[PDB]
Design a protein around this ligand. Structure first.
Ligand code: CL
Ligand code: CL
Ligand code: NA
Length: 129
């Protein structure tokens, strides 16, 4: 599923990401934008052999099991395929676990390089939340 900006801002808000652990919702939307271009089925292989899955490109080296990343953990206790669903519950709750790791949203390299320190509020501008 390819979410609309406001539509994802909405679903995220519901699933409780808005200001989750201090990050305004506009950050989560920004991260979604530049990680997956709002698509739930986005996958991208990393050279280390791991793969990033879903709206927030969750990585298999640590967070989900895809059965093809040797010596990786499955901390979110889920099959990486679950992060590819129209339903964003899995990606959310997992992102919650990730962003709590201690390093916050820097865990997302597109967030750090493309959202961090930018006017993120714009991503939720005009949306009926
Ligand atoms: Cl694996
Ligand atoms: Cl933080
Ligand atoms: Na894993």
């Amino acid at each position: 599923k390819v979410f609309g900006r406001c539509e994802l801002a909405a679903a995220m808000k519901r699933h409780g990401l808005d200001n989750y652990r201090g990050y305004s919702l506009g950050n989560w939307v920004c991260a979604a934008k530049f990680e997956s271009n709002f698509n739930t089925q986005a996958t991208n292989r990393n050279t280390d052999g791991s793969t990033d899955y879903g709206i927030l490109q969750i990585n298999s080296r640590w967070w989900c099991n895809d059965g093809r990343t040797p010596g990786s953990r499955n901390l979110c206790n889920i099959p990486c395929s679950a992060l590819l669903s129209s339903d964003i519950t899995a990606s959310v709750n997992c992102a919650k676990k990730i962003v709590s790791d201690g390093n916050g949203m820097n865990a997302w390299v597109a967030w750090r390089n493309r959202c961090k320190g930018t006017d993120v509020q714009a991503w939720i501008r005009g949306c009926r939340l």
